[PDB]
Amino acid sequence: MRNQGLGSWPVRRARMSPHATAVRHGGTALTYAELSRRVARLAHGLREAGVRPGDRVAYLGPNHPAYLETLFACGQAGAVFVPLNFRLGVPELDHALADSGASVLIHTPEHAETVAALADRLLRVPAGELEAADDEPLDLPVGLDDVCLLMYTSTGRPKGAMLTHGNLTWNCVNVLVETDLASDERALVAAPLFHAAALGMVCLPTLLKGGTVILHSAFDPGAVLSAVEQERVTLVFGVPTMYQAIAAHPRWRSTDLSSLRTLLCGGAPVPADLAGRYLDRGLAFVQGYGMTEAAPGVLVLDRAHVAEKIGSAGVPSFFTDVRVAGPSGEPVPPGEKGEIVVSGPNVMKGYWGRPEATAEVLRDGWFRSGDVATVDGDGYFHVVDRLKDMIISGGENIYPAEVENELYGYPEACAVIGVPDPRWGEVGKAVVVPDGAELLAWLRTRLAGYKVPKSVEFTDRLPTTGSLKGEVRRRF
Amino acid sequence: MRNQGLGSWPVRRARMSPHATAVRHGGTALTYAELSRRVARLAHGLREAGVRPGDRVAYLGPNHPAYLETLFACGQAGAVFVPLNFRLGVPELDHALADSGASVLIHTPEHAETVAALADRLLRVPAGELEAADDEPLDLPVGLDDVCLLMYTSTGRPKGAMLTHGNLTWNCVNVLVETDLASDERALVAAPLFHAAALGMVCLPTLLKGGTVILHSAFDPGAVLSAVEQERVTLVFGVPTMYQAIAAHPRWRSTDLSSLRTLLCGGAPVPADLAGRYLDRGLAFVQGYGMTEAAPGVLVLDRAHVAEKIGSAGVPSFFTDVRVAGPSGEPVPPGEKGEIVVSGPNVMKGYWGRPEATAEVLRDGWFRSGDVATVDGDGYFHVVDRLKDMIISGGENIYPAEVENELYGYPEACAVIGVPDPRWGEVGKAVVVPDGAELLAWLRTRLAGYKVPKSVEFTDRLPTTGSLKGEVRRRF
Amino acid sequence: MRNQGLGSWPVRRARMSPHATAVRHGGTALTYAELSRRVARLAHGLREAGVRPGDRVAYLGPNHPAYLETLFACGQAGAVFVPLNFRLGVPELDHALADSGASVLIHTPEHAETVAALAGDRLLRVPAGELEAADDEPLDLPVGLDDVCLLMYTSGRPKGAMLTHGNLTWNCVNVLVETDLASDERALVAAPLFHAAALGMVCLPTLLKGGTVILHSAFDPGAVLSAVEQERVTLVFGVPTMYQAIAAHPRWRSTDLSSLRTLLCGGAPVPADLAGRYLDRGLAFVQGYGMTEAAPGVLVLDRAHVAEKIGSAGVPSFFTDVRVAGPSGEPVPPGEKGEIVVSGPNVMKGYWGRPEATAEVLRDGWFRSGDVATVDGDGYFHVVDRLKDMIISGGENIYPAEVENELYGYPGVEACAVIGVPDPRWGEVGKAVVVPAAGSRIDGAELLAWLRTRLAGYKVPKSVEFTDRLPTTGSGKILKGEVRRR
Amino acid sequence: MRNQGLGSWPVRRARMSPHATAVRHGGTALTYAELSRRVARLAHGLREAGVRPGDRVAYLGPNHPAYLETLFACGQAGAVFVPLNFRLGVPELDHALADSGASVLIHTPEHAETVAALAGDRLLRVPAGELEAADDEPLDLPVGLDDVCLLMYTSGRPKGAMLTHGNLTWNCVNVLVETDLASDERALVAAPLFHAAALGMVCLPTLLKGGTVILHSAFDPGAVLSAVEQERVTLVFGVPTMYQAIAAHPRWRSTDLSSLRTLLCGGAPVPADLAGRYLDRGLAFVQGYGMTEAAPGVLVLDRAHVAEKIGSAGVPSFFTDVRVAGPSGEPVPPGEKGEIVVSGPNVMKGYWGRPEATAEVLRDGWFRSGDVATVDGDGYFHVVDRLKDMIISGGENIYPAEVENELYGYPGVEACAVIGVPDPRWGEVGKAVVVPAAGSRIDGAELLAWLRTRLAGYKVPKSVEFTDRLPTTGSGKILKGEVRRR
Ligand SMILES: Nc1ncnc2c1ncn2[C@@H]1O[C@H](COP(=O)(O)O)[C@@H](O)[C@H]1O
Ligand SMILES: Nc1ncnc2c1ncn2[C@@H]1O[C@H](COP(=O)(O)O)[C@@H](O)[C@H]1O
Ligand SMILES: Nc1ncnc2c1ncn2[C@@H]1O[C@H](COP(=O)(O)O)[C@@H](O)[C@H]1O
Ligand SMILES: Nc1ncnc2c1ncn2[C@@H]1O[C@H](COP(=O)(O)O)[C@@H](O)[C@H]1O
Ligand SMILES: [Mg+2]
Ligand SMILES: [Mg+2]
Numbered sequence A, B: 001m002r003n004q005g006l007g008s009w010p011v012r013r014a015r016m017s018p019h020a021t022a023v024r025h026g027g028t029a030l031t032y033a034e035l036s037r038r039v040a041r042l043a044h045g046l047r048e049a050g051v052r053p054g055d056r057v058a059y060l061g062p063n064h065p066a067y068l069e070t071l072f073a074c075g076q077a078g079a080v081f082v083p084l085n086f087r088l089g090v091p092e093l094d095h096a097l098a099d100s101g102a103s104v105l106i107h108t109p110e111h112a113e114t115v116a117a118l119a120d121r122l123l124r125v126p127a128g129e130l131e132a133a134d135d136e137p138l139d140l141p142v143g144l145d146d147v148c149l150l151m152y153t154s155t156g157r158p159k160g161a162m163l164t165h166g167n168l169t170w171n172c173v174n175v176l177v178e179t180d181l182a183s184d185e186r187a188l189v190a191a192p193l194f195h196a197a198a199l200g201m202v203c204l205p206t207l208l209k210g211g212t213v214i215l216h217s218a219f220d221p222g223a224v225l226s227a228v229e230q231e232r233v234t235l236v237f238g239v240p241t242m243y244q245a246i247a248a249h250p251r252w253r254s255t256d257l258s259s260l261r262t263l264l265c266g267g268a269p270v271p272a273d274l275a276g277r278y279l280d281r282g283l284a285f286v287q288g289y290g291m292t293e294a295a296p297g298v299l300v301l302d303r304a305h306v307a308e309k310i311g312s313a314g315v316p317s318f319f320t321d322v323r324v325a326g327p328s329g330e331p332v333p334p335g336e337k338g339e340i341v342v343s344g345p346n347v348m349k350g351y352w353g354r355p356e357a358t359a360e361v362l363r364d365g366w367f368r369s370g371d372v373a374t375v376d377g378d379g380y381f382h383v384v385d386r387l388k389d390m391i392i393s394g395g396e397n398i399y400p401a402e403v404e405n406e407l408y409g410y411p412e413a414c415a416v417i418g419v420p421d422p423r424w425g426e427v428g429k430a431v432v433v434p435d436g437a438e439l440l441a442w443l444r445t446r447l448a449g450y451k452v453p454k455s456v457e458f459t460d461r462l463p464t465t466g467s468l469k470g471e472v473r474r475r476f
Numbered sequence C, D: 001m002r003n004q005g006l007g008s009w010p011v012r013r014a015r016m017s018p019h020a021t022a023v024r025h026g027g028t029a030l031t032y033a034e035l036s037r038r039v040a041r042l043a044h045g046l047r048e049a050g051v052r053p054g055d056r057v058a059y060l061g062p063n064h065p066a067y068l069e070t071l072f073a074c075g076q077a078g079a080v081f082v083p084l085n086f087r088l089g090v091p092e093l094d095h096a097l098a099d100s101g102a103s104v105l106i107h108t109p110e111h112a113e114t115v116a117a118l119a120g121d122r123l124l125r126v127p128a129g130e131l132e133a134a135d136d137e138p139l140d141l142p143v144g145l146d147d148v149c150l151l152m153y154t155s156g157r158p159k160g161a162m163l164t165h166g167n168l169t170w171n172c173v174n175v176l177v178e179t180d181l182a183s184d185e186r187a188l189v190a191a192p193l194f195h196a197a198a199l200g201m202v203c204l205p206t207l208l209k210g211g212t213v214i215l216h217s218a219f220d221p222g223a224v225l226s227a228v229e230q231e232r233v234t235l236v237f238g239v240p241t242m243y244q245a246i247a248a249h250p251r252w253r254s255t256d257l258s259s260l261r262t263l264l265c266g267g268a269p270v271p272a273d274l275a276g277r278y279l280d281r282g283l284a285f286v287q288g289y290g291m292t293e294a295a296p297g298v299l300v301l302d303r304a305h306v307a308e309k310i311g312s313a314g315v316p317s318f319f320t321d322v323r324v325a326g327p328s329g330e331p332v333p334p335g336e337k338g339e340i341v342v343s344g345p346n347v348m349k350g351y352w353g354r355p356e357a358t359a360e361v362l363r364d365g366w367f368r369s370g371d372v373a374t375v376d377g378d379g380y381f382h383v384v385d386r387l388k389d390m391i392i393s394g395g396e397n398i399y400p401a402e403v404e405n406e407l408y409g410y411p412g413v414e415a416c417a418v419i420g421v422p423d424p425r426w427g428e429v430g431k432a433v434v435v436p437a438a439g440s441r442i443d444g445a446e447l448l449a450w451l452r453t454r455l456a457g458y459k460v461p462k463s464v465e466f467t468d469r470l471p472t473t474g475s476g477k478i479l480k481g482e483v484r485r486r
């Protein structure tokens, strides 16, 4: 078989479990054989619409069978898939389509308006039209080092992370090594497949294991609770906010959750209170740390250590290597702070048409996360902060997230930011929404003096749309 | 991490589950951390004994922790491991050591006599001596295309199958894709680790998943039954003969088997009667077809189809491609006979220092199994016979195994062999152990005339040590 | 340097010989310094026009600096170059553009009309020299030797040969190993650069060596002779028909040829007449055999061995392996006929979008030439015919070239071609198509009767049809897609 | 052909120029045909003696056909060649054999005693020419360009540079691109083949081009001159000390040097005296800079640019990238000092069994030269000193070569060396070690007092110790492991 990439997956799965159900969405159920044939038809269709090896095909739409069909079809046509972030403005879609140089944009009816407003040598086709009339799979030569997809990463305009067929395959291998999945898996995907997390951590590994991927086009806590008991979901991925919204809904206590085997949380660390609430209900989080550039898995905190290592990001996935390094590039003394750097077959080729930006951050197979961390005696990592947020005050490092985290012990939302100073170069400045007074004096009971902000401004709201933004700087 | 091969596995597993038990043998229990440190010490030890990248280290001994320690140590030293078949004569050991050019032979006390009789620029050291006094892992550069081990294949002298770190890694990925293993796996290894089957199908995948490998230096049906209930085994690999011996032992009915989740059978097809007996007891066989040259997995018949497709070899493992091909090299019309040929990342680099012999059988990534087969409408394969046993009679193919299989319906053991003929070029000759008469007339009720042997010789015993041999030819 | 491909060549060469003349075209000369600045301006320009890694850029025009600028600019932009046969009509160009999926076409002004008529909605049509951006700093995109450099179309429908950066780099290494080029070469490219021959055998190796490529937009033997003595050409590539026209020109005696060091001849063998005419003016041919799919070098017959091994295609280039194989695939009894099969780092990735057609001719890195040949005890290859021109008649093979060779011995046969035609008795039978000399009269029955004299009856065509002209390539090979016409 | 490595070179070359002389050594000449038969006999012989893929075979002896036979036979047997420094004592050879893990040692008869004293239990000791098997059919084992061809030991303890088949192949491509070699080269190898210079810059490229390698077992300027005029040498490699001894010989005027086309000089820059002495006999040096770990080519200063860019190490070879980097790793303000870092397919796999020492100097395919240098506006490199010879004195850098350069200007300083010596005030301070001319008397205090005249006080050594001779390499570089002696 000449196609070694994701394009071949539907065909390989169909030889193994043709009649097993692969995708559920509204009333739509696709078996593996139905997926293979629908993929082979869209591939031949992209060929006929003039798609050639290395060409980019964008998808603008929600979690939906068309997402996976476009993904596998691209692979089958030797093309590069581009899953757009469906929440972005026209200017931003335009930027993503210009940069990737997409030659075809496949979209769902609800985006038809927005698609018609996009900047003219792009073939914009509604999902289902482009599909052709052969349903025998193409077998084009695709190696694992060939780019499978461009995933745009939000300090500059967005950059396309080049994830190879190899990157996503080896990420799925990592998941199968560290988590226990089976043939009879029923995985609920209510996080977006346009993020590496839903796609890499749950969708692809469930399809590869011959289980069922249940897609929701939207996140609703209630639909997720109903889905869990009605569909007998074994496997869910979410970010803390999605598990917060689920636990907080009226039917949290009423819903039957005995079917859940594996609850994956990524994106950010699970707050202690949230982990405790799921634990109280018999549910333990597997916590993942990762990034787009690692396709995305890097560290796993297993359900056994979730309580024993509170707000650890965990240990390396099997085929990855992870270290904390200085600016010096060398490993730091254990317990000391440095930058998480990642290496392995899951790590990206680079940023699409940005080779210099790539070289700042990728070198000798090692990717710079932009995360400050410590490694404890047991090789468990502890994320401190974003290296970009770091304040330098009389040559001493201040991690806002440490100072912020103390401010939250005070009787809503806060940001600590760097501010020029005539003699220290930079000094802390707390921005707080509440009912006030100068209790920086409380912070002086809690922090190294030099870490305490020298000023505190009260406000009414902060740019907290992130679901906080360092545009707080702009309001110094 | 520069070592991408099996040598790195103990270190990667120890970052993940240090305190979980990896190996049980007599009273010996090794945790992953204990395995990593023991491996790092044997690696440094091999270095100090003058082992350099690409050097061969042989192991002569039974299933035992020293087997895995030598395997991982070789990998860690950038060396090539050579697991000898412990049942072979001195002349045959000599041939395997000459051909591989082993520079170190590590052995267990019981083989000390035999090792002292071996032909003088070989360093012969008992297991445990060579071990050194650093226990920090070496990180030498090892790629997946580097040879991990030489596995000798029984029509000529034995040939060393070069299995790369890549071959064994991708075989383990295949196993994790098609079978459901967990962190809490307890796998019994009473088949020899010097075969690709025990090593590739069970041992490596169980270690990679963070479970426990229970080794028995010998096959005893009784010890296996006791082991299953006393140790709570979830996972067993065997050949039909080993499952035949287990089911036939006094304590078959008495033994508690509720712990068994996955029963793997390989080597040959499970006789209907044997599959039925395990089924009657609630136990379903996953059947594997494979060969040394595929590291070794190729086809899987899952527990769901074990009854529905009796004596099918099954469908391709996910990352493999399998076809029946003519001498013409092309796929054959469905249902027609041809040679199973295998392709994929599990398939060997070639036979050690035999490039011409390799080229007869490996070409464009495709390996010739030497197995005649058919593929049915559902893509399920059916092994007919060994291409080498095929008889050509007036230009028509006779598969002895088909004729033999009819002879076994007659009221012990039989072989059908080719025999020169003045006008047909070759003709059948049945060799039977019983009480006789010429009931080739019964075969004429059952077979195409041209397939019926033209003569039948009765005998007392046949070379049935294989646990039949085409040395029956020699007694034409 | 992250770009290992041809896109990095102008920057690697500008570091060593910045002020040496790289390209001469009439009154225009680029130094290596200027080539690198122009290539980098065009690569930036292409990217501004939406060119991204793997996109296809086509060039329509003759031998021109813009050919080499577009080639190198594509590599620098991580893109794939598509050199179009500039003699094609718009239906054939439409096919090449659609199959390739070119999203940009650069053309010289004489193709403005052809370009206006192309099937194009998502093709940017650009006149050469209108996409030169302000930024002249070389881009350094990650490009490996296994990345595709260009699609070169075959003469079924045209198939796009995927030549990698490695394929073309290793062809140049083959040329440097077997031919003696120096930093003062003055190479005349009067054959088309859209063929592998001029590009791979003369153009790129000369640029690699810091030499001067002299381009002619067209072949005129009179321009070639003026150029050799005026420009002191050291190196020429041509097919035998070019070298014939050069020798049959009135200024062949008066032209100073003393500068000529290396005469490369490919496409077909040099007739004994041709060798003799050049021998007597001191000039010997290095004869090469190759194909598009080997980028293109495979065999060479050097000037030292043209004497004893007459009509040989010669011996393998250093990094290339060459064999004659059975219809099986297995090597043949030495002396007997089989197919030339080629292996090495010069051999293509496969045909673009045509994986099944690729697998029929490319397995285990061995390419099926479609050439029938023998190999002698000395490893010298002898090309007999094209496999697909074979005529099977009562289950015996007939080699038409053996028959055409005999037909040339008959008074007033100026050109001919023997094709397979269906027949119920024999499956196939030969038909001769013969072009008579303008001042010669030929009886069909006498011609056939005379062949029967010379050949086993099974080889002799059953019929003869006369014509004024046969379908010949720009070079002068008979298409044999005159099966269609008779 | 499954062997892509140097092991296949004798068979690839026997196909093209079988009867051309490949190697001449006094009265012995091998044709390419005979080299291939001998290499194949030895490869079979090695395998009979238990040599398998990846095993190490060492050669102890001078420049000799057996060097090249063992090299190519190792490749053909899938094995790794270990060319030992034949000037080493048995403790240093024992180290090289133990670190390499050689399981076979081929030696010429003059090393019979040294070889008898080696620490060996599992080493087969073999006299050259005693492992020639009957089978002369080339083996074709699978060998990739990334397989290790040879371990070349560094001058800590010696480190084994893993040079791949690719590394050495791509060095030869670099040589063919930048130097004008032809099939009639007659290359004199009077420098040792156990160094990368003679092997990679002259020997292998000449064999690739179907030329003749003329080997001398020893360097004697009188033999070199006789050989040039008698053998009509076209190509020579040497370090400046070899070219100095050749020019200071009585038969330099009477020797016909007219055959010389290419003079390659590596190791160190040619003094202005040397260039002038060769200029006046019509001869110009192609000057190369390189190291073992780049197989070894990196920079070249061609004869066309030796005039204006005096003391330059020149510009990068075509397939090699070269930069000056901060202690950071980042490129430096142009004109300022940093370390030469090298990238390209010629750069080694790493040091054998020494992955940590490798990672200190080799990341992202960039190798740290240990050379301090500047680059000018023209991309020409200027080597200043070795990084590890730097003297840090009150946190200021002192370049000893800048100080030794000034010391050479003082009456009767024949040789000298400046080393770092510990000091409590400044961390480090310089000490001069000076060899006086046999007929010169020098006051230490006056020498230092005069340096103070010429240099900032912080650069001037605090002490001077006199000696009769300094530790110099076979070439003539000062070891600087005279730190040990003073
Ligand atoms: N489990 C986690 N714990 C803490 N921070 C995390 C975790 N997962 C992701 N992050 C943060 O989010 C980044 C990933 O960004 P993205 O590629 O957009 O998913 C990481 O580099 C961290 O800064
Ligand atoms: N499941 C199976 N069914 C039938 N034959 C098998 C099966 N597994 C292995 N074999 C046979 O045994 C061979 C493997 O030999 P070995 O490499 O020694 O294990 C295959 O090529 C088949 O001939
Ligand atoms: N020297 C030659 N002698 C005979 N045929 C040749 C020679 N050079 C090229 N050819 C033919 O031209 C074909 C390549 O065509 P093309 O790829 O279009 O250049 C070869 O496969 C041969 O059939
Ligand atoms: N042309 C040259 N000019 C200056 N130093 C050189 C030159 N060629 C070689 N070297 C020095 O020799 C080193 C290589 O030593 P080796 O690897 O033992 O040949 C380089 O790193 C330089 O320090
Ligand atoms: Mg950039
Ligand atoms: Mg053989």
Ligand SMILES: [Mg+2]
Binding pocket: C021, C024, C029, C212
């Ligand atoms: Mg000029």
Ligand SMILES: [Mg+2]
Binding pocket: C353, C354, C355, C356, C357
């Ligand atoms: Mg096709």
Ligand SMILES: [Mg+2]
Binding pocket: C087, C473, C474, C475
């Ligand atoms: Mg033409």
Ligand SMILES: [Mg+2]
Binding pocket: D021, D024, D029, D212
């Ligand atoms: Mg000679």
Ligand SMILES: [Mg+2]
Binding pocket: D353, D354, D355, D356, D357
């Ligand atoms: Mg070390």
Ligand SMILES: [Mg+2]
Binding pocket: D087, D473, D474, D475
């Ligand atoms: Mg020396």
